[PDB]
């Protein structure tokens, strides 16, 4: 096999996504070279769980899943297994048995506007915590209190989504951060995606 895994379509896309509606891409039947990844000298965070971030280009995986986000910098630590917070349980939940790698880099030069970038959203209110690897794109009105909310927002009926509204003047903890999560699977099935060996 000689196909090259399409990391460019996910690591260099113009606009990635909103956190609450993160898109997932299935990488399989291809050859992935990780030299460009861990030796880019541009990723602020390259935290690998369950695998050594240096020898990941020599063991073969059954398939890979690439997930994208644009989040707030100070919230990046919430994208680790076990950690909980505002986006770790209402927007994106990682299983405690994770075996992937979380990559994150600051992108205030592409995902910020002087007036304000009200184009990236995250879920603020939800009835219960998200299950591991679950999406929730429904915009149903969050019924707080006791009186039913018949579909019209107002008093005691909140709108679940909220906007980050990035600006190119906030601190490093309030600037955009592009995040890519690579989930592997060390199953017993015959592997089909992995880096060049011989």
């Amino acid at each position: 096999i000689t196909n090259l895994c399409p990391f460019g379509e996910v690591f260099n896309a113009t606009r990635f996504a909103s956190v609450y509606a993160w898109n997932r891409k299935r990488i399989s039947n291809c050859v992935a070279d990780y030299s460009v990844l861990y030796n880019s000298a541009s990723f602020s965070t390259f935290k690998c769980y369950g695998v050594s971030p240096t020898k990941l280009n020599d063991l073969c995986f059954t398939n890979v899943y690439a997930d994208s986000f644009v989040i707030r910098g100070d919230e990046v630590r919430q994208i680790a297994p076990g950690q909980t917070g505002k986006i770790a349980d209402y927007n994106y939940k990682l299983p405690d048995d994770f075996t992937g790698c979380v990559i994150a880099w600051n992108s205030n030069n592409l995902d910020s506007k002087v007036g304000g970038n009200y184009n990236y959203l995250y879920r603020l209110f939800r009835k219960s915590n998200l299950k591991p690897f679950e999406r929730d794109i429904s915009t149903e009105i969050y019924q707080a209190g006791s009186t039913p909310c018949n579909g019209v927002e107002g008093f005691n009926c909140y709108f679940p989504l909220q906007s980050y509204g990035f600006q190119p003047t906030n601190g490093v903890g309030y600037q955009p951060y592009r995040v890519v999560v690579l989930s592997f699977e060390l199953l017993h099935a015959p592997a089909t995606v992995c880096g060049p060996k011989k």
Partner: antibody
Amino acid sequence: QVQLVQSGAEVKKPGASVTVSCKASGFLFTGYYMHWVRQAPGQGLEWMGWINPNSGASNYTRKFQGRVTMTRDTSISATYMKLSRLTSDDTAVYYCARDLAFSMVRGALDYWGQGTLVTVSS
Amino acid sequence: QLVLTQPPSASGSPGQSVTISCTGTSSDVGGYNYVSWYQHHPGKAPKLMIYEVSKRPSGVPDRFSGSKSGNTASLTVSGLQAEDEADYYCNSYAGNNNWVFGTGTKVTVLG
């Protein structure tokens, strides 16, 4: 610091439409509900309506139902209010106010605009 | 249409305390604990004196104190000084996603 700037004073003939704008700066535009209030000459305050600058939802009082429409423009971070079918009993000063709570509506109007004077006469 | 009643006027010599009462139906004031008080000066936009029922926004002094009992809210100003001449309004939630302002009280420093 925050800042809400309204459109200039307007004079309209009876039976017309007035579009008053409120531009917000210095804070997260989407996340604080906006309220529109009115004060006629020597009549005290009067709460007109309520608009959400995030989802675009809004609600009014039965008095103004079918006459007032509120809109948002997040591209320039502005809130527009259109009052149609004016009458001599509508000349007043209109204020756009920012709610206090975050992502919720509670009626605490901590920050206020400057007040736009709208006059209707023949 | 619903209306919240307030006394036509209130007065007090500089130094002592004055009180303003805002009365409404049980579905306006008694029903919910959201009764804010605003101060309005001539030529300036109204300023939020207190919100909720007793909380004070940053900036206002300790003179103003609000409290609600039964179906009536009350705002008390202590250490009245000459700069308190203004119209005080009570804003309350009235159900059906609607807020209602009171008639307002013009406070006069008398002396």
